[PDB]
């Protein structure tokens, strides 16, 4: 039983891609660039 | 903790824009209507029922109470 070598390799590659995507989902310190404007 | 993440969601721009437009136009006509209605009620007042004087026939619009209805 267990993973075949191709399954290990594909899981590892997909894992690296997924972790890079997840890291890229983060926000920079300026990311919410808010446009400011008014008129007891 | 600087762990702020991006929230994937559909565009709310168009729904907000439509709501703002509809609110603006409805208010554009309704605010003058509300102010005028209140002004009419406050100063003009409402007609008070009275007996028809002898020899006088009223107009068809003189049988109604509210000034806007008249
Ligand atoms: C330290 C303090 C010092 C100071 C103290 C003194 C001062 C402060 C304290 C003392 C004062 C306290 C408060 C006093 C209250 C009265 C004072 C006063 O000013 O009286 C004036 C005056 C005095 O009354 P009156 O002349 O003696 O009485 C004659 C009758 O009222 C003649 O009747 P009528 O035919 O004119 O009636 C019209 C009727 C209805 O009006 C209409 O029919 C308009 C029809 C329009 C339909 C279409 C609208 C547009 C399309 C909308 C589309 C949306 C999408 O108006 C109302 O419905 C009023 C509702 C009042 C409700 C009161 C509470 C009821 C609660 C009941 C349930 C309780 C449990 C819950 O009364 C009014 O001015 C009423 C104004 C009504 C305005 C209606 C506006 C309708 C707008 C239509 C378009 C809307 C578009 C959306 C935006 C609208 C704008 C936001």
Q: Is B2 on the interface with A (CB under 8 A)?
A: yes
Residue among A22, A26, A36 at smallest CA distance from B2: A26
Q: B55: alpha, beta or left, given left = phi > 0 and alpha = psi -120 to 50?
A: left
- Report the alpha-carbon angle B58-B59-B65, nearest 5: 90
Resolution rounded to one decimal, in angstroms:
2.7
Contacts of B45 (CB under 8 A, 6+ apart): B67
Q: How far apart are CA A31 and CA A7, in angstroms?
A: 38
Per CB-CB distance under 8 Å, the chain A contacts of B5 are 25-27
Q: Which residue's structure tokens are 């702020």?
A: B4
**Which residues, 6+ apart, have CB-to-CB distance to A31 below 8 Å?**
B4, B6
* CA–CA gap between residue B21 and residue B6 (Å, rounded): 29
Cβ atoms of B66 and B41 closer than 8 Å: no
State the best of A26, A29, A34 to mutate against chain B, taking most chain B CBs within 10 Å. Answer: A26
- In order of A13, A22, A25, A31, B18, the CA distances from A18 in angstroms are 9, 6, 11, 22, 38
Q: Residues for chain A: how many in total?
A: 40
Q: What are the backbone dihedrals phi and psi of residue B5, each rounded to the nearest 5 degrees, phi first? A: -115, 155
């Amino acid at each position: 039983s267990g993973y075949t070598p191709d399954e290990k390799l594909r899981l590892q590659q997909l894992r690296e891609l997924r972790r890079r995507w997840l890291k890229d989902q983060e926000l920079s310190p300026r990311e919410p660039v808010l446009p400011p404007r008014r008129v007891t | 903790h600087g762990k702020r993440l991006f929230i994937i969601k559909p565009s709310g721009f168009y729904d907000r824009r439509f709501l703002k437009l509809m609110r603006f136009y409805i208010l554009l006509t309704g605010i003058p209507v509300a102010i005028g209605i209140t002004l009419v009620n406050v100063f003009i007042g409402e007609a008070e029922l009275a007996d028809i004087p002898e020899g006088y026939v009223p107009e068809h619009w003189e049988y109604f109470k509210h000034p806007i209805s008249r």
